[PDB]
Amino acid sequence: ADWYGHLKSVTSFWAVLFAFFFPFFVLPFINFSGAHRLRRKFAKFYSAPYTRFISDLLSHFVLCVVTSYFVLDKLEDTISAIEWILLVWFVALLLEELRQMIFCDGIAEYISDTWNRLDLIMITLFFVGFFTHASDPSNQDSKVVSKGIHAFLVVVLWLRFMR
């Protein structure tokens, strides 16, 4: 009941996913618990833990798919647009990990969890690989070594999606 928040308990994974993907077309015609109604239903639906998990899953799934595309496709002679997007994404992930470090019951409690360990390994692997490519972008050897470190990055990312 806490998981689903202010929403009916009969909602399935596909129903919440469809409502998340199509906000204006499935939400009004549903039962829960104008500006002050549409606004009330949004403010209630997106504050639900389940909705934030679903958003985190999809986000991590797109991260896995794009990073997978990035490591399979050849690296350009300069830093590409998808590389910049991934750079912004992994800084954001690093800041989220730091926020989790500060707002917890100690560094030991945070580092005890295996998924947090996987998060550090994936941030560490990406930047090693990125800086390896970004040090000499036209060098063929740098691109080969960068893809070699990023193979390990994709393995840890798909392992972390089991969370």
Binding site: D2, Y46, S47, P49, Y50, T51, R52, F53, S55, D56, L58, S59, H60, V62, L63, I85, V88, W89, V91, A92, L93, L95, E96, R99, F103
Partner: protein, 107 residues
């Protein structure tokens, strides 16, 4: 874990981070905004308290009966009861000897 986490998904979580930093800076240094919450009424609190005490009494009554309906408990009581039955009879014999003497000295 997912209750306290910001809603915005990961690529866009930077907006949430800068928003939390802005609120922390505005609260610590600026001291302009604050926190608002809702407090449960005393009526609903006493209702919860009354419900919990009743159900506590109900579980203790059900628990006591159920433990008295076990096979071991029944054998143990039966055992104590037969011992108490002897003791009573033993008192009864003590009385009958006293009677015997009353008639004996009566003859």
């Amino acid at each position: 874990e997912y209750k306290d986490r910001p809603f915005l998904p990961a690529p866009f979580i930077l907006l949430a981070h800068v928003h939390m930093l802005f609120m922390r800076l505005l609260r610590l240094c600026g001291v302009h905004t604050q926190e608002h919450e809702k407090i449960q009424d005393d009526e609903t609190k006493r209702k919860i308290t009354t419900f919990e005490e009743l159900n506590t009494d109900k579980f203790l009554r059900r628990w006591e009966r159920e433990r008295q309906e076990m096979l071991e408990a029944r054998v143990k009581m039966t055992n104590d009861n037969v011992v108490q039955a002897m003791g009573m009879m033993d008192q009864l014999l003590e009385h009958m000897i006293s009677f015997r003497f009353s008639l004996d000295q009566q003859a």
